[PDB]
């Protein structure tokens, strides 16, 4: 009956819980739990609670790119593609002149790469900016060109899909006509037994917005416009299954900001909402493998570790999973 930020969700519904039925917003009741509906809470002052381009209504009603995983339908989870690049092989092409060698243009490297999406989103024009390193020395920072642009990185899928060979990476120019050089010093250092490593400094791409009736527009809508905002107002949770990795970013409240009206979440609730787990017998299960604190290994960095120590020494239950999640903590879950 009163909407401030124009997401077609009233403030009372957003604050007290709501659900989407036949593309309209209704109050949440406990009787809707058995049908498969979920309880949603968002920010009644911000159009996008999580920072991803899709608004609260689009995320809740699922009127977006259907390749987005269903765990991102919750408005508090950021639809945010985490794209890494795995290096599978390296090919050395030395240009010896036999009928002579040059110590500035002595080798050509063709690196076999393979993209990996682990986030809750498809990244429509994957353009990784990868730097090759050896001995801590950065060889080259090259952005993928039109040959190497891999469109359609589905969640949990590699751009050269299963059964296909890795992508080839051998050109540094914007138009793929100049091969990556290596001088004689590091050619001999590579011959001495060292290994080229590859790092992904950043990945550029696009997201498909909905336009007209069923139209999907991908041009001019880049992910880098929202990557910084998402990484600012979120916290990262990484599950490490024996066969897959799942990285999610969940929006968390700010105590020092009184106008920040994002809903409060615990770390356990955030894990449940991010990974789509099931609350059975009070325990959390995600795809027939236990995920609770006593069953897995939790890994944090320094600030998160000290944060949880302070919060535990101030808390009464003395358990990790029922403590407040705040903006900017890294959690790694290993099973």
Partner 1 sequence: PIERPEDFLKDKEKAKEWERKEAERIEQKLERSEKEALESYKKDSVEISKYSQREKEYKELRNAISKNKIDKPMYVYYFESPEKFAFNKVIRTENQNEISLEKFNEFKETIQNKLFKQDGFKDISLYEPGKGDEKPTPLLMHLKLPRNTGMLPYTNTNNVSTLIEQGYSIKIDKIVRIVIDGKHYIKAEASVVSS
Cite the annotated binding site for Ca(2+) by residue number.
3, 5, 7, 9, 11, 14, 43, 46, 56
Residue 75: strand pairing partners? none
Site string for Ca ion, 26-55 (x = CB under 5 A): ----------------xxx-----------
**Partner whose footprint covers residue 91, from partner 1, Ca ion, a copy of itself, none (CB < 5 to 8 Å by kind):** a copy of itself
Q: Does 101 bind a copy of itself (CB under 8 A)?
A: yes
Please report how close the Cβ of residue 317 comes to a copy of itself at its closest, in angstroms. 26
Q: Is 231 helix (H, G, I), strand (E, B) or coil?
A: helix
Q: CB-based contacts of 68: which residues, under 8 Å, 6+ apart?
A: 79, 120, 121, 122, 155
**Partner whose footprint covers residue 26, from Ca ion, a copy of itself, partner 1, none (CB < 5 to 8 Å by kind):** partner 1
Smaller CB separation from a copy of itself, 170 or 304: 170
**Partner whose footprint covers residue 14, from partner 1, a copy of itself, Ca ion, none (CB < 5 to 8 Å by kind):** Ca ion
In this structure, are residues 113 and 167 in contact, taking their beta carbons and an 8 Å threshold?
yes
Smaller CB separation from partner 1, 14 or 247: 14
Dihedral angle sign, alpha carbons of residues 112, 118, 123, 128 = negative
- Gaps in the chain with C–N over 2.5 Å, residue before each: 99
Q: Does 262 bind a copy of itself (CB under 8 A)?
A: no
> Stretches 198-206, 240-248, 265-273, 290-298: which one binds a copy of itself (CB under 8 A)?
198-206
Write out the binding residues for partner 1, residues 44-103 only, by CB under 8 A: 57, 61
Token pair for residue 122?
């498809």
> Stretches 71-79, 204-212, 271-279, 297-305: which one binds partner 1 (CB under 8 A)?
204-212
Q: Bin 152: left if φ > 0, else alpha if -120 < ψ < 50, else beta.
A: left
Distance separating alpha carbons of residues 286 and 291, to the nearest angstrom: 7
Give the 3-state secondary structure of 134-175. Answer: ECCEEEEEEECCCCCCEEEECCCCCCCCCCCCCEEECECCCC
**Partner whose footprint covers residue 2, from Ca ion, partner 1, a copy of itself, none (CB < 5 to 8 Å by kind):** partner 1
Q: Bin 220: left if φ > 0, else alpha if -120 < ψ < 50, else beta.
A: left
Please report how close the Cβ of residue 168 comes to a copy of itself at its closest, in angstroms. 4
In this structure, are residues 54 and 48 in contact, taking their beta carbons and an 8 Å threshold?
yes
Smaller CB separation from a copy of itself, 281 or 302: 302
- Which residues form the interface with Ca ion (CB under 5 A)? 3, 5, 7, 9, 14, 42-44, 56
- Which residues form the interface with partner 1 (CB under 8 A)? 1-6, 8-10, 22-26, 57, 61, 209, 211-213, 215
């Amino acid at each position: 009956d009163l909407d401030t930020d124009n997401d077609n969700i009233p403030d009372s519904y957003e604050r007290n819980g709501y659900t989407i039925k036949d593309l309209i917003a209704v109050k949440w009741e406990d009787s809707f739990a058995e049908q498969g509906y979920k309880k949603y809470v968002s920010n009644y002052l911000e159009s996008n609670t999580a920072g991803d381009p899709y608004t609260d209504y689009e995320k809740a009603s699922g009127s977006f790119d259907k390749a987005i995983k269903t765990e991102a339908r919750d408005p508090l989870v950021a639809a945010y593609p985490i794209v890494g690049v795995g290096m599978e092989k390296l090919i050395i092409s030395t240009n010896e002149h036999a009928s002579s060698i040059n110590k500035g243009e002595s080798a050509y490297i063709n690196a076999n790469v393979r993209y990996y999406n682990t986030g809750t989103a498809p990244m429509y024009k994957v353009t990784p900016t990868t730097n090759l390193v050896l001995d801590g020395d950065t060889l080259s920072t090259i952005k993928a060109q039109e040959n190497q642009i891999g469109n359609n990185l589905s969640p949990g899928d590699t751009y050269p899909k299963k059964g296909l060979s890795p992508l080839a990476l051998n050109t540094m120019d914007q138009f793929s006509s100049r091969l990556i050089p290596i001088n004689y010093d590091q050619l001999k250092k590579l011959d001495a037994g060292k290994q080229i490593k590859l790092e992904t400094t950043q990945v550029s791409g696009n997201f498909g917005t909905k336009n007209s009736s069923g139209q999907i527009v991908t041009e001019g809508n880049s992910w880098s416009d929202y990557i910084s905002q998402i990484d600012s107002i979120s916290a990262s949770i990484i599950l490490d299954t024996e066969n897959e990795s799942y990285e999610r970013r969940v929006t968390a409240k700010n105590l020092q900001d009184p106008e920040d009206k994002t809903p409060e979440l615990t770390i356990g609730e955030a894990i449940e909402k991010a990974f789509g787990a099931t609350k059975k017998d009070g325990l959390l299960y995600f795809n027939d493998i236990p995920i609770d604190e006593s069953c897995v290994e939790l890994i944090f960095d320094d600030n998160t570790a000290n944060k949880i120590k302070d919060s535990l020494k101030t808390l009464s239950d003395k358990k990790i999973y029922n403590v407040k999640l705040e903006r900017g903590m890294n959690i790694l879950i290993k099973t």
